[PDB]
Amino acid sequence: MASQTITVGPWGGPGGNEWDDGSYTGIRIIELSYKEAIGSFSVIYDLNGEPFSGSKHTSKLPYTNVKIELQFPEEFLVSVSGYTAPFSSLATRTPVVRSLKFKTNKGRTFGPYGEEDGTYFNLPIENGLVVGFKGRTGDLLDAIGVHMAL
Amino acid sequence: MASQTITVGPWGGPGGNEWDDGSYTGIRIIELSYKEAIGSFSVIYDLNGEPFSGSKHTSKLPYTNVKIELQFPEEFLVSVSGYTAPFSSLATRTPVVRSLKFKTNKGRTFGPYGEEDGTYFNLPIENGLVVGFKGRTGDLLDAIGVHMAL
Amino acid sequence: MASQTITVGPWGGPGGNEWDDGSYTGIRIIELSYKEAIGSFSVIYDLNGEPFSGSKHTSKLPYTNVKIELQFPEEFLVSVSGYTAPFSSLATRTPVVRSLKFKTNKGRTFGPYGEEDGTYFNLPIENGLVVGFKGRTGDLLDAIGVHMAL
Amino acid sequence: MASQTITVGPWGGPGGNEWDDGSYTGIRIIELSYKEAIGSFSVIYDLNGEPFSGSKHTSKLPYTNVKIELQFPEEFLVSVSGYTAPFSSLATRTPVVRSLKFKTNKGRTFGPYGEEDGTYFNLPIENGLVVGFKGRTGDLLDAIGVHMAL
Ligand SMILES: OC[C@H]1O[C@H](O)[C@H](O)[C@@H](O)[C@@H]1O
Ligand SMILES: OC[C@H]1O[C@H](O)[C@H](O)[C@@H](O)[C@@H]1O
């Protein structure tokens, strides 16, 4: 009964534990870690002109960390894409987010991070904004979904 | 540029200094002060299930303080109304918000607070939710407007 | 169920029979009739770049006909306002729409139509667009409300 | 412009003429034709409780026609997916939509129609409704996108 946003996804599997950051007014910074798949994933959002830190979604796997810094508000995501598949190590197992790639309205590209292994997904946005992320994390990013608004 | 909401108003006059709390997921508490007019006006928002304290828009005048606590999220505002006019010592030239009055979907009325003098304003909400307030404040609540989503 | 819009109002009384044109993409023309109150009310909407005629909410009373033609798409409404009150030769007793006035982003004012008797209502719009009207009609316009979108 | 919706995609290629049906209040019927790719694509939308026929984007090619009738408003689309790739049979090997598939909230699957050749696409919708389709059609369905609303 509170305020809601359009939500697309998830892409990824049933594994790991639900999270949902909720909705805000834009993206400032995305922080992720990666190796053979995506590990950690966390976001500094914009909330009405000031940063808001989302709950951290940390894998303790010793992965490479990266800070994607957007030129907010003039720069914003126009595409979120990536690959989903199992990672061999979880014995018998369930699809995770192997790769993420981001494009901005400025023509910047971030990534691809991880390994482009498995089934492709792609959210090209023609009109609208990413205003929040949701997903599932175990030892790593099992699934990812986006909230959108105008 | 960042996420936007439907915004109605303002009601009141061009005095004091502008402010805009922006948009959130809902309303938990409204804090105001009053006597002949509205003084202080501040809001505790809901942002994704937790409280978020908006910026204070305080008056130093010795007015009566009231704290409006809604049972969010099942309770919500379905009307905002009030009167605007000069208050003929500190706002001789421009109208301020003299009164405010809120109704909820559970049939609680809060107010009228202040004095019911001058030009009526009335926003019944048939569908949608008040997500944020903006206004103008000097020693008094010169102006107010509302951001809406759903 | 089906897609929805933010809707505000009603302004007016409970007589007459309810009607709801629904939501569209914008406004091309408003047709009304007036004398001491508003009679007829009907709209030619924009629907994805072509006109779409709303049901006619006509009155048989001997009133003056007005057509408000907007320069769509560049011209849109930014204020809907008016007055409500009972009307003397009313076989019943409850409030009707005595007057309506509209302003646009091009600084055109259409009206007041009717008489400015009774209780004032005013919807300034700072962000978003009139995408439909609802109301109540008998021999006169008993009430009026507005759907809004981005 | 006039009123807007969140728009995602397009998926497919830059061939054949632009079309955009715009936005409505939901979907009733989708009509398409298929064989090696999608040819024809047209939609009967809901508009405020009544059917509204979108513009026809017919293919002349001698393809198999199908009619997808959703039990509107209780049933609606929760996934749009498909495949894009060039089609040997046009000399222009600009990518067209080779197949589509539609799932609903009741567990119905319509498709796949056409052949599942080239790059997958997939829009699963967690919250929100498809209100509109946009695309590109020459000989065949070159590309497709969706408008979403709440
Ligand atoms: O997140 C990747 C995997 O990590 C952990 O091993 C979880 O137990 C498993 O459910 C999840 O799929
Ligand atoms: O807020 C009431 C009034 O008082 C302030 O002290 C300001 O100087 C004036 O601009 C404002 O209209």
Ligand SMILES: OC[C@H]1O[C@H](O)[C@H](O)[C@@H](O)[C@@H]1O
């Ligand atoms: O519209 C004015 C009035 O007109 C009609 O006569 C109706 O019977 C009444 O219900 C309504 O209030």
Ligand SMILES: OC[C@H]1O[C@H](O)[C@H](O)[C@@H](O)[C@@H]1O
């Ligand atoms: O519709 C599929 C193809 O057929 C048409 O004839 C167009 O000329 C071409 O641009 C398009 O890619």
